[PDB]
Structure 1
Amino acid sequence: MKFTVEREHLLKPLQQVSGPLGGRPTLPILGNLLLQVADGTLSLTGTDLEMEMVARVALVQPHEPGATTVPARKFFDICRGLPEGAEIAVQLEGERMLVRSGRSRFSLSTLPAADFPNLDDWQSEVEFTLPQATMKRLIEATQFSMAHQDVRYYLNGMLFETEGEELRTVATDGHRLAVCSMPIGQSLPSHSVIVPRKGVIELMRMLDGGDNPLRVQIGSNNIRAHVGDFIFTSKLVDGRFPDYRRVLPKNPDKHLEAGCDLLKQAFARAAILSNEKFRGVRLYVSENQLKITANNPEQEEAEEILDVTYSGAEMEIGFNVSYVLDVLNALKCENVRMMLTDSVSSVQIEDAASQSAAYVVMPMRL
């Protein structure tokens, strides 16, 4: 296996396939990349057994076919360290891979390609394409609400649902929920899968802004996402997600609208003097006014009063200010709508200007 490639043509591909990886996987080879020259193409693959990322680079310089497995972080670090515009020449030599550029030379340890974990083939059942920025919006709107290492293992990832011509994400912790829905211009079967949170993370990071469409293929136990020269595959979480329809408030009749930043800043100051563990804050709503109060066990007390747009019945509600601040921080918009019912019902929060994303936070008795 020989190839000579310009540094910059390797950097983005290396960075993408090092995503699954780690620097003691225990299983050593998981800390290696797989390099394959076949045809006029270098392919690079990294995996953690659950998911796999593969990148392809066109070889316009002379090459020879073959395959090996090298330490991913060492190889990336060498390529990154070499100067802007460097030509990088790579050669298999015995049990070692040689890397030369200018006056610099490296020989890395290898592990047999034949030994590199392969994900089983599987058949695609549902497919669609959509713009990258659309998938990226969908994930970023909701990712912060996934659980991390909950016993309820199906919460530790993100639901991707297709319905009508819409693709929707849903993430919940069991405490707060996020849902985002975008039209993507293709009639879709009605279908749900759960992508593991590590996979959501890798998917999110393969999306580079650009003009390359994302093609998605879903099978019974896998998902694959292909954009330009990058192909991501993951196992799905074999589990039953909650239904977000059962979580949204029922026709809330009390709408408050405020400046997102003014609201965020008020909650952020009040939060200083909230209970460190439970983070309860109280809202008092009244005609075009919101009062926020926080206390803590030391009986310190904050209070914020700000002008808002509200014409509903006066009411109080409590909730967790960290959850509310996470939503406000996700939204990044001019104005926010809080859809309220009473002191004993969840709140739904949205960009005043778009119903695409919606967030549900549960009431606290304070």
Structure 2
Amino acid sequence: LILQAERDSLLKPLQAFTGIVERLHTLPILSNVLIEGRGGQTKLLATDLEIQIDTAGPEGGAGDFRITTNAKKFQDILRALPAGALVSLDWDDNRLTLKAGKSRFALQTLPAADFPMMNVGEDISATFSLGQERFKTMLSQVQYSMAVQDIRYYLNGLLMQVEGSQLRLVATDGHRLAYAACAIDADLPRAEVILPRKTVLELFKLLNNPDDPIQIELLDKQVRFQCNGTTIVSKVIDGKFPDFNRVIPLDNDKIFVLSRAELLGALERVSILANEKFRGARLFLQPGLLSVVCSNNEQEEAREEIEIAYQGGELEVGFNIGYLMDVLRNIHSDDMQLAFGDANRSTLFTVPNNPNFKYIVMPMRI
């Protein structure tokens, strides 16, 4: 006998080790979760040689043990059990015996000696903390602009940059850029990391205590996030992120504020009759009116019009409709401020009276 605990006390910690665990990795033991009982406390660990996540488990364990067992089989067995049943883990040679009621499961285990661990750096360069809700909001505000498998590996990620008392998240794919910022209660030297996309998604899943804070530590080519009794260590995408200050336009004088829900609904309605290869939408900006127009190969046209408090000169501008709907969906403000220059230059998307979020899209010549 190695462990005995309630079902959920084992099932919940395991649910932090599903995205990182690759169901079919070239290394067999990488499909296993590591269970370590020491000092009357249980630790659950998982890794993919790139993201290593650990957490505390149940406490009803007698003796020290270190095993690895298949993650998917173990988690499915736990979740298939009644919510509130007792689970007993016994160790017999290379086998783990799970007992629950009249249910036996004879899993095969692998030695913990072969379980790989990340050689975590010891060179903390910056440490700070911030509200989990605030950090999750920023990540949601910037995540959609990351390039998915670009030829430039530094764009396949999210730049996290700390400078003074400001934390900034920047994402870009080359045709758009999302920038978010917040005030952090610290004074830190200017540091920056490029979190990989998998790290961004796992961190997004992790932040589930909106009232508690999360601590972030920057290391020698590593980042460690600690919160809710869970620790995540991830390698950074090496290289240089583009200087986001050049990207942001400062001369877009055609400015008007309009309801975000109204524009999102208009775009969703007109995208149905948009061309399928190009997915373009034309915005016609004129004093008092904004028109969203789409047309396809079959000689069909969709057109919606929005009343706007706008004054300046006219402008016809084409946009990739996915870029527009991304910001219109991932921002939960009531209104959005649109700043236009001319037809072949960038457009700025902001939240009125909110300097801490910016979004830049270049147009497409439709």
**Superposition TM-score, scaled by structure 2 size:** 0.96
| In structure 1, C-alpha distance between the alignment counterparts of 2:91 and 2:31, rounded to whole Å | 19
Deviation at 1:209, TM superposition (A): 2.7
The amino acid across from 1:77 in the alignment is D
The answer on whether the counterparts of 1:19 and 1:46 sit within 8 Å (CA) in structure 2 is no
Q: Residue 140 of structure 1 aligns with which residue?
A: 140
Match of 2:67 in 1: 68
Contact kept in structure 2, 1:69 and 1:112, CA below 8 Å: yes
Distance 1:140 1:104 in 2: 42
Q: Please list the CA deviations of residues 135-184 of structure 1 after superposition, one character each: whole Å capped at 9, or x if unmatched.
A: 21121111111111112111111100112211111111111111111112
1:80 aligned partner, one-letter code:
R
Deviation at 1:353, TM superposition (A): 4.8
Task: State the SS of the aligned residue for 1:355.
Answer: strand
Give runs of aligned pairs for residues 273-352 of structure 1, distance below 5 A: 273-352=273-352
SS at structure 2 position matched to 1:16? coil
Alpha-carbon RMSD across the aligned residues, in angstroms, is 1.4
Does the Cα contact within 8 Å between 1:57 and 1:229 map onto a contact in 2? Answer: no
State the identity %. 39
Alignment of 1:159-178 (within 5 A): 159-178=159-178
Q: Mark the runs of 5 or more structure 1 residues left unpaired by the alignment.
A: none
Whether the 8 Å CA contact 1:17–1:55 is kept in 2: the answer is no
Letter in 2 for 1:50: E
2:258 equivalent in structure 1? 258
Report the secondary structure of 1:356's partner residue.
strand
1:89-132 alpha-carbon deviations (Å, 9 max, x no partner): 11211101111111111111111100001101312111111111
User: Structure 1 residue 54 and structure 2 residue 58: aligned?
Assistant: no
Offset of residue 278 of structure 1? 1.8
Asked if the contact 2:165–2:185 (Cα under 8 Å) also holds between the matched residues in 1, the reply is yes
Provide the residue aligned with 2:77 in structure 1: 78
Q: Helix, strand or coil: the match of 2:139?
A: helix
Could you tell me which residue of structure 1 aligns to residue 236 of structure 2? 236
**3-state DSSP of counterpart to 2:79:** helix
Are 1:110 and 2:109 matched, yes or no?
yes
Given residue 228 of structure 1, which amino acid in structure 2 is its aligned partner?
A: N
Report how many residues are paired: 365
Cα offset, 1:235, TM superposition:
0.5
| CA deviation map 1:39-97 (0-9, x unaligned) | 121111111111111011251x3421110000001111111111111121112111011
Match of 1:16 in 2: 16
Give me the whole-angstrom Cα distance separating, in 1, the residues matched to 2:81 and 2:149. Answer: 39
**Within 1, Cα distance between the matches of 2:6 and 2:77?**
13
d(CA) in 1 for partners of 2:18, 2:92: 24
Query: In the alignment, what sits opposite 2:44?
Result: 44
* Residue matched to 2:99: 100
Q: Is the 8 A contact 2:42 2:61 kept in 1?
A: no
Q: Distance in 1 between matches of 2:145 and 2:160?
A: 14
Q: Is the 8 A contact 1:40 1:58 kept in 2?
A: no
Alpha-carbon distance in 1 for matches of 2:193, 2:103: 48
Instruction: State the Cα distance separating 1:280 from its structure 2 match.
Output: 1.6
Counterpart of 2:180 in structure 1 is 180
TM-superposition CA deviations, 1:203-242 (whole Å, max 9, x none): 1111113433211111121000010210000001111111
Partner of 1:121: 120
Q: How does 1:26-37 map to 2 (within 5 A)?
A: 26-37=26-37
How far apart are the structure 1 equivalents of 2:37 and 2:337?
Answer: 54
Task: Tell whether the 8 Å contact from 2:284 to 2:315 is kept in structure 1 after alignment.
Answer: yes
The 3-state SS of whatever aligns with 1:326 is: helix
Partner SS state of residue 54, structure 1: strand
Letter in 2 for 1:289: L
Amino acid aligned to 2:243 = D
Q: For 2:302, give the aligned amino acid.
A: A
Provide structure 2 residue ranges, at least 5 long, that are not aligned to the other structure.
none
For structure 1, which segment, 237-246 or 66-75, has the greater mean C-alpha deviation from structure 2 after superposition?
Answer: 237-246
Alignment match, 2:356: 356
Give 4+ residue runs of structure 1 displaced > 4 Å after superposition. none
Partner letter of residue 280 of structure 2?
A: G
Deviations 1:229-262 (A, max 9, x none): 1000000111111122111112321112111111
| Alignment check: 8 A CA contact 1:335 1:353 kept | no
Counterpart position of 1:201: 201
2: CA distance, partners of 1:242 / 1:12: 39
Structure 2 equivalent of residue 224 of structure 1: 224
| CA distance in structure 2 between the aligned counterparts of 1:225 and 1:260, rounded to whole angstroms | 33
Q: Which amino acid in structure 2 is aligned with residue 63 of structure 1?
A: A
Map of 1:269 onto structure 2: 269
| CA contact 2:10–2:58 (8 Å) conserved in 1 | no
Distance 1:336 1:290 in 2: 14
SS at match of 2:170: strand
Q: State the secondary structure of the residue aligned to 1:231.
A: strand
